[PDB]
Design a binder for this molecule. Structure first.
Ligand SMILES: Nc1ncnc2c1ncn2[C@@H]1O[C@H](COP(=O)(O)OP(=O)(O)OP(=O)(O)O)[C@@H](O)[C@H]1O
Ligand SMILES: Nc1ncnc2c1ncn2[C@@H]1O[C@H](COP(=O)(O)OP(=O)(O)OP(=O)(O)O)[C@@H](O)[C@H]1O
Lengths: 38, 124, 469, 49, 62
């Protein structure tokens, strides 16, 4: 259905910071190419 | 026999200060024109099984009250948490200065625009 | 003897196979887990080799090789380990054909001396007295480090610091011990202060004056736990609860809790010496200063500002503020990387391009010199040129391009052109390195060639191992 | 077009990313070239079927 | 908050819950399903002869 008629709305800062934090978290794990344990 | 947490919203309504002790460290005074607020009208409204005290047109309160009159304690306790859950839905939306239609409407529109943007760049 | 020769090569090849992915600003990150069970996420090549905990003597010599580059140059730690391991890879093909290692060692020195004169003529000489060329070269290497937004402001702080201690275009060797950087919580990096004297992060507690003019400072080592012989020389500043009361009556500033590493720094600022006892404490061991006070700044905190040494000595100190504690420890290394890059130009007033640029002309011109040589200098020097191409082959891997087709296209660009062509890791492609503002000093490449050749000569000279109790 | 870049020894991802970008602009007869290591109009180069 | 997995790959996703409530206060698990599906699609790119450096620079522009 249309969200304008149903009134289902979300803030912009919960949508912007979700796409900002998820790509920076996916960048850090993708930069791992070697494992060292002690 | 007024509750303490109810009095913190009353003193915040009329802008008055809560006085803990009446003794001003050497004697006894009432602290005139300091712990008093302003209002318009206080009516003792006849409500069934609890005669309430309503306050109108205080200094800076902006709050109100909803009297959930019902039949028993089963339908009144479930309707109070329904009003509290419906309050936080409208509250968290109308704060942040602009909103976006969510619930799957954001990511479905981004799946088509970012694919057409991907065919415009190239370069691995 | 072949079982020990190949064991030193394959152990050193395993070290270079791990550190090579962390090459460049676009290098791959590493996951280090210590023995206690914790995890640490960092990509600095000098940090990984410190936490490698190797046990072979060939791999332990590469640990000392990594610390040998930071003391003379202070830049390019991981670039030395890759060319050291890839040289033994090319030496493995030569050792199968029947060549003694003592002939490859002397031929690598002739490849080293020919590699210096190739890098000498291809370099661009710069002027040391011009502070503008010292400013843009220091902010270039700082843009690839952690602190990258303050590189345009921290670079003149390092240029003006070396001009007060070292005379321009006259001295060769610069000792980095007499320079100090301080840091405190609160404030910003945008506000700076260059103190010609000394600064301590301690307090004047609980001396309730904190302001003394015409001050003579005596460093006391005998712990007060007596005050009349201190007043016999008229001392007003001492540098180290019942002792606090009598010292306030004699009106002397009391500053304690000083590290022994900071004691040598005070010995060069004013010219004072640490005393041993009270009877030895006389006026011949003190100094002279016109200002000694504690200024309560908004961001720098409560710092001791002492200026006016009026004594022979070449000291200057930089006061740095900053909000977080994790920022100021990286900001201290940001100026330290800017302090070391100026130290590379005062010994060699020249600059070269970066991003795999000089390794192409080092691999192509050494091959042309190998065609005219004879003996073992036609094969081992040609293998020395083949191992110089592992740096643009790894830089093409970390940039996201083809590791073979990028170096092959770079060899044709350097055959007709010059050192301007190279790999740009910011835009991800072959372009002019001098136009995208990427430069490196001369000693980051000419000492990396010398230290890696001396390590291979030390490795190939090892024939057998022996246990000793 | 991907196995045509694999059997010719070319970069299979560098050509195919530029080939789809050429079709997105309006190129209707652009494909891979067996001689040159780039894309070309196969209708102009008489590569027909 | 109560999920305790002793693995460094899972320990990366533990800290983004602390960056979510301190920034806005909501959103938390929508970051987790997006970033994990970002890693699963990028893992297919590693098998398809793509270096992750083009994946990292392509994700920031996306
Ligand atoms: N801006 C740049 N563009 C392209 N390549 C670069 C750039 N900066 C550095 N490099 C390359 O990266 C290599 C250095 O790798 P890395 O930055 O991982 O170590 P480092 O930080 O220089 O170590 P140290 O500071 O201890 O010398 C150099 O050989 C150089 O060729
Ligand atoms: N009124 C609504 N109608 C339809 N879908 C909704 C509505 N409100 C929220 N959603 C969906 O529910 C999801 C939220 O899930 P949930 O509340 O269980 O966890 P979360 O809030 O995402 O976690 P976190 O608190 O970290 O962000 C959102 O992805 C959103 O798409």
């Amino acid at each position: 259905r249309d969200n304008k008629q149903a009134g289902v709305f979300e803030p912009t800062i919960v949508k912007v910071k979700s796409l900002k934090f998820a790509t920076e978290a996916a960048i850090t794990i993708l930069r791992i190419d070697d494992l060292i344990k002690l | 026999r007024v509750l303490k947490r109810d009095l913190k919203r009353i003193a915040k309504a009329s802008g008055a200060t809560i006085l803990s002790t009446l003794a001003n460290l050497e004697g006894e005074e009432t602290f005139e024109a300091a712990m008093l607020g302003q209002a318009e009208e206080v009516v003792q409204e006849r409500i069934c099984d609890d005669e309430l005290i309503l306050i109108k047109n205080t200094k800076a309160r902006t709050s109100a009250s909803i009297i959930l009159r019902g039949a028993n304690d089963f339908m009144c306790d479930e309707m109070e948490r329904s009003l509290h859950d419906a309050l936080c839905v409208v509250k968290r939306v109308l704060e942040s200065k602009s909103v976006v239609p969510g619930g799957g409407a954001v990511e479905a529109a981004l799946s088509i625009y970012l694919e057409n943007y991907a065919t415009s760049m190239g370069s691995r | 003897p072949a079982q020990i020769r190949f064991s030193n090569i394959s152990a050193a090849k395993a070290v270079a196979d791990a550190i090579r992915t962390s090459l460049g600003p676009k290098g791959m990150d590493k996951m280090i887990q210590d023995g206690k069970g914790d995890v640490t996420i960092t990509n600095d090549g000098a940090t990984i080799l410190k936490q490698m905990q190797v046990l072979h003597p060939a791999a332990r010599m590469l640990v000392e090789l990594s610390k040998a580059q930071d003391i003379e140059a202070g830049d390019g730690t991981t670039s030395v380990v890759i060319i050291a391991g890839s040289l033994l890879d090319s030496c493995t093909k030569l050792l199968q054909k029947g060549i003694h290692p003592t002939i490859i060692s002397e031929s690598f020195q002739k490849a080293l001396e020919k590699g210096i004169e190739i890098l000498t003529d291809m370099s661009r000489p710069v002027e040391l007295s011009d502070r503008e060329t010292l400013l843009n070269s220091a902010t270039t290497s700082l843009n690839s480090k952690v602190v990258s937004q303050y590189s345009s402001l921290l670079s003149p702080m390092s240029v003006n610091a070396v001009m007060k201690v070292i005379d321009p275009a006259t001295a060769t060797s610069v000792d980095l011990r007499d320079i100090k950087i301080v840091k405190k919580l609160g404030g910003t990096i945008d506000d700076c202060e260059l103190v010609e004297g000394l600064v301590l992060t301690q307090k004047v507690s609980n001396s309730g004056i904190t302001r003394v003019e015409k001050a003579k400072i005596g460093l006391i080592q005998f712990c007060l736990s007596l005050v009349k012989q201190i007043k016999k020389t008229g001392c007003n500043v001492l540098l180290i609860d019942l002792a606090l009361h009598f010292l306030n009556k004699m009106k002397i500033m009391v500053i304690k809790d000083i590290e022994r590493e900071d004691i040598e720094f005070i010995c060069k600022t004013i010219g004072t010496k640490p005393v041993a006892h009270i009877d030895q404490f006389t006026a011949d061991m003190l100094g002279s200063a016109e200002l000694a006070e504690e200024v309560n700044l908004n961001g720098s905190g409560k710092l001791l500002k002492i200026t006016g040494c009026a004594s022979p000595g070449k000291t200057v100190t930089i006061v740095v503020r900053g909000s977080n504690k994790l920022v100021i420890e990286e900001a201290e290394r940001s100026i330290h990387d800017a302090l070391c890059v100026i130290r590379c130009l005062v010994k060699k007033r020249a600059l070269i391009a970066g991003g795999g640029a000089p390794e192409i002309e080092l691999a192509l011109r050494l091959t042309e010199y190998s065609r005219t040589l004879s003996g073992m200098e036609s094969y081992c020097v040609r293998a020395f040129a083949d191992a110089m191409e592992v740096i643009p082959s790894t830089l093409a891997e970390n940039a996201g391009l083809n590791p073979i087709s990028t170096v092959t296209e770079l060899r044709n660009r350097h055959a007709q052109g010059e050192k301007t062509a190279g790999i740009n890791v910011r835009k991800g492609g072959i372009s002019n390195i001098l136009e995208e503002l990427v430069v490196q000093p001369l000693l980051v490449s000419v000492s990396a060639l010398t230290l890696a050749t001396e390590t291979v000569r030390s490795i190939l000279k090892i024939d057998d191992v022996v246990n000793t109790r | 077009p991907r196995q045509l870049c694999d059997n010719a020894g070319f970069d299979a991802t560098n050509i195919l990313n530029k080939l789809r970008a050429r079709h997105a602009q309006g190129g209707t007869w652009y494909g891979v070239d067996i001689n040159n290591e780039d894309i070309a109009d196969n209708f102009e180069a008489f590569v027909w079927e | 908050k109560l999920l305790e997995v002793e693995h460094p790959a899972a320990k990366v996703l533990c800290e983004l819950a602390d960056l979510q409530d301190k920034e806005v206060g909501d959103g938390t698990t929508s970051v987790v399903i997006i970033a994990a599906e970002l890693l699963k699609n990028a893992d297919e790119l590693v098998k398809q002869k793509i270096h992750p450096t083009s994946v990292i620079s392509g994700y920031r522009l996306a």
